[PDB]
Structures are given as C-alpha cells and as structure tokens.
Write an enzyme that holds these catalytic residues in place. Structure first.
Site, PDB file in Angstrom:
ATOM      1  N   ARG A  54       0.809  -1.219   0.000  1.00 27.76           N
ATOM      2  CA  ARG A  54       0.000   0.000   0.000  1.00 27.76           C
ATOM      3  C   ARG A  54       0.836   1.260   0.000  1.00 27.76           C
ATOM      4  O   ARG A  54       0.591   2.168  -0.786  1.00 27.76           O
ATOM      5  CB  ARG A  54      -0.947   0.055   1.201  1.00 27.76           C
ATOM      6  CG  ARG A  54      -1.917   1.237   1.157  1.00 27.76           C
ATOM      7  CD  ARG A  54      -2.491   1.546   2.541  1.00 27.76           C
ATOM      8  NE  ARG A  54      -1.539   2.257   3.400  1.00 27.76           N
ATOM      9  CZ  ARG A  54      -1.299   1.949   4.672  1.00 27.76           C
ATOM     10  NH1 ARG A  54      -1.933   0.935   5.246  1.00 27.76           N
ATOM     11  NH2 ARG A  54      -0.433   2.661   5.383  1.00 27.76           N
ATOM     12  N   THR A  55       1.810   1.321   0.900  1.00 28.10           N
ATOM     13  CA  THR A  55       2.667   2.485   0.983  1.00 28.10           C
ATOM     14  C   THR A  55       3.455   2.604  -0.313  1.00 28.10           C
ATOM     15  O   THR A  55       3.661   3.704  -0.823  1.00 28.10           O
ATOM     16  CB  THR A  55       3.623   2.391   2.202  1.00 28.10           C
ATOM     17  OG1 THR A  55       2.865   2.539   3.413  1.00 28.10           O
ATOM     18  CG2 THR A  55       4.674   3.479   2.148  1.00 28.10           C
ATOM     19  N   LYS A  84      26.036 -11.560   0.694  1.00 24.60           N
ATOM     20  CA  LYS A  84      26.965 -11.857   1.780  1.00 24.60           C
ATOM     21  C   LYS A  84      27.222 -10.710   2.762  1.00 24.60           C
ATOM     22  O   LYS A  84      26.783 -10.754   3.915  1.00 24.60           O
ATOM     23  CB  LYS A  84      28.298 -12.329   1.195  1.00 24.60           C
ATOM     24  CG  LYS A  84      29.348 -12.620   2.254  1.00 24.60           C
ATOM     25  CD  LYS A  84      30.669 -13.041   1.634  1.00 24.60           C
ATOM     26  CE  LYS A  84      31.728 -13.258   2.701  1.00 24.60           C
ATOM     27  NZ  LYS A  84      31.360 -14.364   3.621  1.00 24.60           N
ATOM     28  N   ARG A 105      12.355   2.281   1.875  1.00 21.08           N
ATOM     29  CA  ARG A 105      11.666   1.673   2.999  1.00 21.08           C
ATOM     30  C   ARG A 105      12.624   0.569   3.446  1.00 21.08           C
ATOM     31  O   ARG A 105      12.980  -0.283   2.654  1.00 21.08           O
ATOM     32  CB  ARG A 105      10.345   1.092   2.507  1.00 21.08           C
ATOM     33  CG  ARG A 105       9.621   0.197   3.498  1.00 21.08           C
ATOM     34  CD  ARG A 105       8.890   0.968   4.556  1.00 21.08           C
ATOM     35  NE  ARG A 105       8.029   0.085   5.346  1.00 21.08           N
ATOM     36  CZ  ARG A 105       6.907   0.494   5.927  1.00 21.08           C
ATOM     37  NH1 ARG A 105       6.531   1.764   5.786  1.00 21.08           N
ATOM     38  NH2 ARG A 105       6.172  -0.350   6.653  1.00 21.08           N
ATOM     39  N   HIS A 134       8.491   7.742   9.913  1.00 24.73           N
ATOM     40  CA  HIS A 134       7.659   7.544   8.733  1.00 24.73           C
ATOM     41  C   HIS A 134       6.999   8.894   8.363  1.00 24.73           C
ATOM     42  O   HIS A 134       5.769   9.044   8.400  1.00 24.73           O
ATOM     43  CB  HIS A 134       6.605   6.469   8.984  1.00 24.73           C
ATOM     44  CG  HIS A 134       6.059   5.884   7.722  1.00 24.73           C
ATOM     45  ND1 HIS A 134       5.231   4.781   7.708  1.00 24.73           N
ATOM     46  CD2 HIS A 134       6.227   6.239   6.427  1.00 24.73           C
ATOM     47  CE1 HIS A 134       4.916   4.485   6.463  1.00 24.73           C
ATOM     48  NE2 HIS A 134       5.508   5.356   5.662  1.00 24.73           N
TER      49      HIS A 134
HETATM   50  N1  LIG Z   1       3.311  -1.035   5.288  1.00 24.87           N
HETATM   51  C1  LIG Z   1       2.813  -2.287   5.951  1.00 24.87           C
HETATM   52  C2  LIG Z   1       2.136  -3.208   4.933  1.00 24.87           C
HETATM   53  N2  LIG Z   1       0.958  -2.522   4.313  1.00 24.87           N
HETATM   54  O1  LIG Z   1      -0.195  -2.562   4.890  1.00 24.87           O
HETATM   55  N3  LIG Z   1       1.234  -1.940   3.216  1.00 24.87           N
HETATM   56  O2  LIG Z   1       0.128  -1.342   2.705  1.00 24.87           O
HETATM   57  C3  LIG Z   1       4.039  -3.024   6.594  1.00 24.87           C
HETATM   58  O3  LIG Z   1       5.095  -3.068   5.951  1.00 24.87           O
HETATM   59  O4  LIG Z   1       3.849  -3.518   7.746  1.00 24.87           O
END
Ligand SMILES: N[C@@H](CN(O)N=O)C(=O)O
Ligand SMILES: N[C@@H](CN(O)N=O)C(=O)O
Ligand SMILES: [Zn+2]
Ligand SMILES: [Zn+2]
Lengths: 310, 153, 153, 310
Positions: A54-55, A84, A105, A134
């Site tokens: 989602r993100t 490694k 991320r 974040h």
């Molecule tokens: N960002 C969430 C997963 N998610 O809901 N993405 O939309 C995670 O890495 O825990």
C-alpha cells in the site's frame, strides 16, 4: 527556490511548522489543480528493502501523477541485494548515480539517514525505517485532519489502541504538539499505554492530555478519533481478547459523536473497526488513505522542483 | 639543544598531559581514542598514588595539543581529570572536561537493529544531562538510552 | 651545596620491565595480554629512542614477574625483546622471548567456519618454524596458516 | 582396561598405530562373532547437527547391533535448534548429562573437539566435522583394505578424483602412511591435485608416490583403486565435463587389473563409477560401506566396554 528544494525528507522532527504548512499547502494545491507533467523527465527510485504494498503503491502512484519515471524493487527475497556482506552504503552509492531521487523503505531504524550520507546531491525520502520514522504517513494524517477540521490547532484528538509501539501515533502526537491549544485523549490498555517520554514532552509544552479506559468516555468531545492497529503478536492471545474489549470501534459507539468528527486509522484495520462503521459519515480512513497521494506528491514536487506549485 | 634529561619515568616538554585519571580508565582512553597511533613520544603511568588516599592513571604525550571539543570528550570517562597544556604551562582557562553536545566514534548503539552496526559510518550520539543519569540519542536510529546502558551492553 | 647521588624517585621497585619493544607494539601487548587490568602500578614509555635509527616502546609493571612461558608469548610480537625480573635485576642469565610451541587466547583463527568463533572457548594454536614464515595450527579446525595471515586477522 | 576405553575419538591423527590395529582387530572379531547385548544398558546420542543419512544409519545400526539404545536428531533444520542463540557448548553440557556416549556430525571444523571440553567423562565420537575429520570413515576404509588385501603394508594404492577437497582421501593417505612400504598413485585433474602438504609428509617418510593423468597408466600394479566423488560445483559445468575424461571408471578399464584388486568409493558414486562395474569381482564399495557397521561397532565397544571382545 522553495525551502524544501533538494532537501532530504528523513524525520518529521526535522520538519518545522513552516515546513509542514508548506507541504500541506502544496498538497491542497495539487489536489485542486493536478500537474501531470511537473516532474516529466525525472526518474525516481522506489527502493522497498522491506515490502509494504500500500505504501509502495501510494508512493509510486504519486510519482506517476506528476509524470516522473519509476524504477525500484522489494528486497523481500525478490532481488539479489547484499547477499553476503554488501552494505546499504554501497547500494546507495550506486543507485544514487542512476536516479534523481530515492524513496526507500528499510527494516533498520536509521537506514534513510545513512542513505543520506552516500547519495551526494540526490535527495532521499524516508518511506519508513524500522520502528523510527515515517514522515509521509504523518503528513498525510495532518493533511486529512486539516482538510476535515479546517485547522490543526485547538482540536480534541483521541488516540486508541497500541499507543506504546505504534510509532505512527508517536509521530502524529509530536506533529500536532507543534500547533496550539490541542487537547489529547489517550485510550489504551495499561500494557500498551502512551510512552512517558511523550507525556513528558506534552507537559513541558503545557499541552493538556488525559488517559481513559473507553472511547465512549470521551466520544462526545472528540474531533478526531485516531484508531490504531493492535498486533496479535504483541500480547498473549488470551491477553488480547481480554483487552481488545472496546479498543475496537463499532457503529453503535458513535451515537453521540460530534457532526464534524472523523475516524482515522493507519489502515490495516481488520481487527479494530467494524465494517458497519464504514457507512457512517465519520469513517475517513479510506479518504485518509486517498490523501497519501497528495501529501506524497507535494513532497516530491517540493524537493524536485525549484519553484512553488501553480 | 635545550631539553635537559634522560627520564624514562616522569618528564616534560612541548606536550599535552591529562591529569587525575581514575584507575582502569587510563588504558580505556588510550584504546577508545587511539592515543598511541602517534609517532610522537608518550609516557603513561597507571595505578599510581593519588590525592593521598586512592589510585589513578596518568597520561603524558609529547609534541601534541588537545582542543576544546576534544578534552571535553573525556568528560564521560574522566570527569574530574585536568588537562594542563605543557609547551610550558601555556594553558589559559581552567581546562576541565565539560559535557560535549555530541560524542562520536567511540560509543556503540545498544539498539541491535540500528543501521550503524553493519555499515561504514561513525557512531554519533547527542548528549543530554539528567538527574542521576545521562541521555545519549543515536544520530541514526534516534533511540535514546542512558550512558549506563551504552557503556555496558 | 651538592646533591650527590643519581636518582629521581623514578626507576625503583621489585617489578618486571619489558623493553626494546618495536614501536606500535607496546599498546598491542597491553591490550592483547590485558596487562593494565592489575591493581598495581605500571610505567609506560612509548616512542622513546635507544640507539640506531630505530623505534622503541617500553612497559614497566610492578610487584609481578612473568613466568618462563609467559615471556615467550612475546616472541611473535616482540622478537628478541629483552626482559628483566627487577627486584633489582633478578633477570636470570639471559631472558629474551623464545618461540613458544603453543599460543593461546590472543590469536584468532582465519578460518571463518571454525567452531572457535561463536563459542566460549579460548583460542589455541600450535607453533612451528619454517623459512620466511611461522606456521600456526588451530587446535579446533586443525587448519594451518602462516603468522602473516593470522596476524592480519 | 583397553587403551581406548572412555577416550574421545575425534581425529584419525590422535590414533596411534596400535590404536588402529586394536580397532581393526576388534572389528574383525565382532564380525566373526556378534555380541548383541554387549552395550545392553547403554544409551547413546546420535546428534547429526548436519544431516548425513548414510553414515547416520550406519552409526545407529552399529549401536543397535551391540544392544544399546539411541536418542538423537538430524537437526537438519527440523529441531527446536538453538535459534542461532544457544552455543554448541551449552547443547553438549546438557546432552552429556543424559547419555553415556555422544556421536556427532557438525558443519563446523572443530565441533567434536569443542564438545569434548564440555562433555562429562562422556566420550564423544566424531561423525564428521566440516572439512576436518571423519575418523570412522578412515577406519572402515582401512578395515576393508586389510580384509581384502590381507594387510595394510606393501600395497599399491591409487586414488582417483578430487584429491584437493576430498578430505577422506587426505585422512586415508595419512593413515596408510603409518604403515611401511606403501606405494601411492595420484590421478586427478590438475585443478584438484593432492595438496603439497600431503606430498611433503610422504617425502618426509620416504614413501613412494607419483602423479598420473589416467587410471589406465597404473591399472596394472594397483591393489586398491580408491574412487573419489567429484562434485561439479567444485568447478564450472564446462570445466567438469572437459576433465571428466577417464577420471570416471567403467568395466572395460579393468581388463588388466590384478586379481586381488578392489575398487573403493566413499559413495555418492553417481558420477564416477559406471554400473557395469558393479558386477565385476573388483567392485567392493557396497561391501566397503557394509564394513562401516563393524569398524563403528568396534569403536563403540572399545570406548564403552573396559575389556576386549574375543
Ligand atoms: N506497510 C505495511 C504493509 N501494508 O499494509 N502496506 O500497505 C508493513 O510493511 O507492515
Ligand atoms: N554424504 C552425506 C551423508 N549421507 O547421507 N551419505 O550417504 C553428507 O556428507 O552429508
Ligand atoms: Zn542507533
Ligand atoms: Zn580454527
């Protein structure tokens, strides 16, 4: 150029009220009048060392809505990175010679900051580094609150759920504490209460906050009801059940809520908000999610395009 | 030539000298700050007589000076230690280690998931004095601990 | 008015004194052999000349003398180093480190798959001489390396 | 009573000539007259930290043929293994309080010797530790040669295959070098030749050895043809095949072989010995494997039972 031009966007704390205002201002503008060609000949790296669909989809969608090109990955064993002993440093030193911006991320807490030291001139936007920061999630939250409440000051904010580990609410609490006259209501089981360092900060700024055992206890006063995710893996299975009690929201609980209240949730809500809530005018988590596009578009526009939007 | 002796036990000249170092803290500073990576002469003395009732370490390293944002770096380890510049006492203010705003390259983040551990970067912690404690905030993970934590692990 | 005798309350005590240690090795021995962790004083002299166009480190510890085998443990780092049990030169005939046939606790096996690394055991290597080298055989993995390898860890 | 009673069996090199003779003599005696209740009330641990089905079943069968009981694990990723936390030391300190003997296979060199320092008067038998030792494999090899050739001295031994990494041949060479007048023939691709340290040892003892490129160069004088496994991964596919030549054995090659010759192989012979060899009287790898029961029954008997058998 604009104050955020070519600036790394790593921590919300490094953002001044001025900065937040500028980002939120830009977000509203792009929302009103889209600019699909703003970042036309730019190429952005979407580096999800830790997967988060989602993100990631929100971020990349933002890049496209501005006309930029996108390349990247999801290191969840989908790539051939750092097998490694290949460092994040070297990865950044490489990728930073390819692209005009890095959106990353990572599972480790200071990843984005480290990236900053090896990306020479290329801006890095933190999409989440472990339990630390974040930035864009907070910006989209503030934008949603501002858009639905018409301001970010003098509001009644309730935060429910896992306030101890939800770094989402820590960042949002601190963000709102940069504005005046806000009153906070913290609803969480004793084993997952807001951390003392956060309360210490609120005290030293003379901000009002109180603890409560149930949502209904303050439902009448709240302008924003921020629902958080309570991970099962946290407590004991029996522990959870014994406490999930009402840190779960149901349509029935909204009988005496303010006409202007909005219910927000970082999103994965399966175990906290009953679907019957989805119909009420207070449910704003999907809209909230939709706003991620504008907050993240605004951020990219600001760091990659010298002049302000229009 | 003007220097005047053959002393392998306790001498002087154009060099910095740290004074009143607590026992077992002298060698620590030698390691943590690689003070022996010098080409310049060095004379140290450990577990020697103190203020008439204890034990202490002593470090004399010739032909080299210390600065403000360096002597201070001794604050967390050798607090009540004095640093007499000795080109021949050309010292000015009461040179005593104060708490630096930042401490780099020596501390190790207690946070195991901190990116700083498996990477080519220098550790870096912000310093804040507390009642009965000292808070150090990692530049990277942004987690804050007490020096008691950071010095044990 | 003439102070006769030659002395300055410097070199006097029954302890041991290791000298003529190659420069940049003194600190190595202190660390590697944890010699500064005793409660009895220590005098250290680093980069203090002796004769030819050469370097020189010195270490003086008191109220303690090193065993015959302990002295040898310097062979690998302080070749031909000179020692002197000093209550007042209690050195035996000629005490210069000889190559031990076994070296423990300081070396690190170069073999990454050796069980010795993640375990609560003290390292141990067998010593043997060759030409242009010194062979060290791990007690655990039984692999053999040249000291040039084992030392450049 | 006996020299090996209660001793740890870790490296073939800790075994003196007399030890080898004692083990081999015991093995022959148990082979001629089984003693099914010799270790009746003993409980032995079969700890395969590294899976090795064949040698594991061989070891365990040996235990049962002497009447002992067996507990263990082939923790080949299927045991509540110390989540890379608990040290081998702790594992052994616990296990050594449950059983009377520990037979262990491990991926790291030195494992068995380390166990030795944490076991309590409880003998440890090394079933293989990385690329270091495999004592019982050399014993069954030695035992098989002695049984088929009537002796271990004055023999012509050819070793074909991967002599660089096949540590079973390194051990077998060093063991046979403890006997007089043996003659060695080394046949291997230059990239996998016998290590110089081995040749140094042989020169030091005046043992006669030579290098050859094909088996048919020495087939005429060989008493023992020890075939080694060559794992393609040790080289690149194109390389392997290129050298593959004749370093593989097939029936036609044994036309001029001595009546007494036996072809040996540690196993996994898939890529070295053609099946048309199995029928010839020279094939002795399956008998060789079968001798593992006797050599390993012998070790268990010696270390756990004071008085000699037969
Ligand atoms: N960002 C969430 C997963 N998610 O809901 N993405 O939309 C995670 O890495 O825990
Ligand atoms: N050869 C295998 C064990 N095994 O099962 N042999 O048949 C190993 O070395 O792991
Ligand atoms: Zn950190
Ligand atoms: Zn080793």
């Amino acid at each position: 150029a604009n104050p955020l031009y070519q600036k790394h966007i790593i921590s919300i704390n490094d953002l001044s009220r001025d900065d937040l205002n500028l980002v939120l201002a830009t977000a509203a503008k792009l929302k009103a009048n889209p600019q699909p060609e703003l970042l036309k000949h730019k190429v952005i790296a979407s580096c999800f060392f830790e997967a988060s669909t989602r993100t990631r989809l929100s971020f990349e969608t933002s890049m496209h809505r501005l006309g930029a090109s996108v390349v990247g990955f999801s290191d969840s064993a989908n790539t051939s990175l750092g097998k490694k002993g290949e460092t994040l440093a070297d990865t950044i030193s490489v990728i930073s010679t390819y692209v005009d911006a890095i959106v990353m991320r990572h599972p480790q807490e200071g990843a984005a900051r480290l990236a900053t030291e090896f990306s020479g001139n290329v801006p890095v936007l933190n999409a989440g580094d472990g339990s630390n920061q974040h930035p864009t999630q907070t910006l989209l939250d503030l934008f949603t609150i501002q858009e639905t409440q018409g301001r970010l000051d003098n509001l009644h904010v309730a935060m429910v759920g896992d306030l101890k580990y939800g770094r989402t609410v820590h960042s949002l609490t601190q963000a709102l504490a940069k504005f005046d006259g806000n009153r906070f209501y913290f609803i969480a089981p004793d084993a997952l209460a807001m951390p003392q360092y956060i309360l210490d900060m609120l005290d030293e700024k003379g901000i009002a906050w109180s603890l409560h055992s149930s949502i209904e206890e303050v439902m009448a006063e709240v302008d924003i009801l921020y629902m958080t995710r309570v991970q099962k893996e946290r407590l004991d299975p029996s522990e959870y059940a014994n406490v999930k009690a009402q840190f779960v929201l149901r349509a029935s609980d909204l009988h005496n809520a303010k006409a202007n209240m909005k219910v927000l949730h970082p999103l994965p809500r399966v175990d906290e908000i009953a679907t019957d809530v989805d119909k009420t005018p207070h449910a704003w988590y999907f809209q909230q999610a939709g706003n991620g596009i504008f907050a993240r578009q605004a951020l990219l526009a600001l760091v990659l395009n010298r002049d302000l939007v229009l | 030539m003007t220097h005047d002796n053959k002393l392998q036990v306790e001498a002087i000249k154009r060099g910095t000298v740290i004074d009143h170092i607590p026992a077992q803290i002298g060698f620590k500073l030698l390691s943590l700050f690689k003070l022996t990576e010098t080409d310049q002469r060095i004379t140290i003395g450990l577990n020697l007589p103190s203020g008439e009732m204890g034990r202490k370490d002593l470090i004399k390293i010739e032909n080299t000076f210390l600065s403000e944002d360096q002597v201070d770096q001794l604050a967390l380890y050798a607090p009540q230690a004095t640093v007499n510049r000795i080109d021949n006492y050309e010292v000015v203010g009461k040179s005593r280690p104060s708490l630096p705003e930042r401490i780099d390259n020596v501390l190790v983040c207690p946070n195991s998931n901190c990116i700083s551990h498996a990477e080519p970067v220098s550790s870096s912690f912000a310093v804040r004095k507390r009642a009965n404690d000292i808070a150090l905030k990692c530049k990277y993970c942004e987690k804050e601990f007490s020096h008691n934590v950071v010095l044990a692990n």
